[PDB]
């Protein structure tokens, strides 16, 4: 049996891992594919818990299509968007 | 006798301390006065070593007068500007 809080904690951690790996360089890899997918699917960019990556996140164009640098700098936190998914709010 | 590298290391650390204290809240205090002075005097904002503060730095309007959010997000790193002062480059 999978608990709401434990599953939400892991998706956030899985995300943090992906984002940490994605900002390392400009190399096309799965982490970028995964980060670009989470961002598009949830309409978010980066996390509050990983603020040290925001500039790097922008530098690698990892935020969704359509929105500018200011919109992406102030985009919705992915950890919150993950919480809303597992709690059914959106 | 004061060594170039040790003095440059301390000004940067003194700065880091000030910036850490300045972003804590919106309270007018010396740390903000000190951070606003360093930023204006050296024409810089935040540090590369303290990227986790950039958004907070913007949130508190701690970057110099005249420049927008994009200019301030991509403003010159204060640790580098401190290095240029102690080495006589500018």
């Amino acid at each position, epitope marked *: 049996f999978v608990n709401k809080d434990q599953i939400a904690k892991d998706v956030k951690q899985f995300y943090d891992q992906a984002l940490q790996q994605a900002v390392v360089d*400009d*190399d*096309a890899n799965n982490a970028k594919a995964v980060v670009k997918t989470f961002h598009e699917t949830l309409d978010c960019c980066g996390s509050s818990t990983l603020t040290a990556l925001t500039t790097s996140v922008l*530098k*690698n*164009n990892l935020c969704p*299509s*359509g929105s*500018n640098i200011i919109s992406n700098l102030f985009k919705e936190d992915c950890h919150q968007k993950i919480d809303d998914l597992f709690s059914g709010k959106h | 006798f004061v060594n170039k590298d040790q003095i440059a290391k301390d000004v940067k650390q003194f700065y880091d301390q000030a910036l850490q204290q300045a972003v804590v809240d919106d309270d007018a205090n010396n740390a903000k006065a000190v951070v606003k002075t360093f930023h204006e005097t050296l024409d810089c904002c935040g540090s590369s070593t303290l990227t986790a503060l950039t958004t907070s730095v913007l949130k508190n309007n701690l970057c110099p007068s005249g420049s927008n959010i994009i200019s301030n997000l991509f403003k010159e790193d204060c640790h580098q500007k401190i290095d240029d002062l102690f080495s006589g480059k500018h």
Partner: single-chain antibody, 222 residues
């Protein structure tokens, strides 16, 4: 008021040169500066790139030992050092900043020496009349995650950025231009084609390294 590029250089085989690129208005300090080679009467070729963040440099295997990239951060300048020069180095060298969005290229530096994701652009040639609606297509060998750009190149001039991302119109570009597409297939539609938009259309992906270009689409009046 972005990229500033260094002047022309005429040289003989065996020489060594330095082409330069100065930014202004960009976070040069923690960015990616790429160099793109354009051989006369031939396509766009990616040379290499510097990450000014860590100082890492990457090159297309062919330019591995000859080419070199260095930076001058306070002056916000990028240098491409080329050694053992030959006739196949006679080309235009464009400087391309990348990272906090998508940018227009430098005007280019002409060097004259005299003595992996595959892109599929379609059609190759297009014979149309003013007011007609045209649809150019670009297909990637893999999902490029909408990190594509459409450019318009007019004879002897630097490629003009039309659409970045898949759908975003670059500032100052007329509304009549429309980018669309996803995953592996992308399109550029030109609504009510005009005289000032004739030439070669290029697509490009920015999903990792090396950067690759479409064959080109030549639009002309009959």
């Amino acid at each position: 008021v972005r990229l500033h590029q260094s002047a022309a250089q005429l040289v003989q085989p065996g020489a060594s040169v330095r082409l330069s690129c100065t930014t202004s208005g960009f976070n040069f300090k923690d960015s990616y500066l790429h160099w793109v080679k354009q051989r006369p009467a031939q396509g766009l070729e990616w040379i290499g790139r510097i990450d000014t963040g860590n100082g890492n440099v990457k090159f297309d295997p062919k330019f591995q030992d000859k080419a070199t990239i260095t930076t001058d951060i306070p002056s916000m300048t990028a240098y491409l050092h080329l050694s053992n020069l030959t006739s196949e180095d006679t080309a235009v060298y464009y400087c391309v900043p990348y990272g906090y969005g998508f940018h227009s290229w430098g005007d280019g530096t002409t060097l004259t020496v005299s003595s992996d994701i595959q892109m599929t652009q379609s059609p190759a040639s297009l014979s149309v009349s003013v007011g007609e609606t045209v649809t150019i297509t670009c297909r990637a060998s893999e999902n490029i995650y909408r990190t594509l750009a459409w450019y318009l190149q007019k004879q002897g001039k630097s490629p003009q950025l039309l659409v970045y991302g898949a759908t975003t119109l670059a500032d100052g570009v007329p509304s009549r231009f429309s980018g669309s597409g996803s995953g592996t297939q992308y399109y550029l539609k030109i609504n009510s084609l005009q005289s000032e938009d004739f030439g070669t259309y290029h697509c490009q992906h920015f999903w990792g390294t090396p950067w690759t270009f479409g064959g080109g689409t030549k639009v002309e009046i009959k």
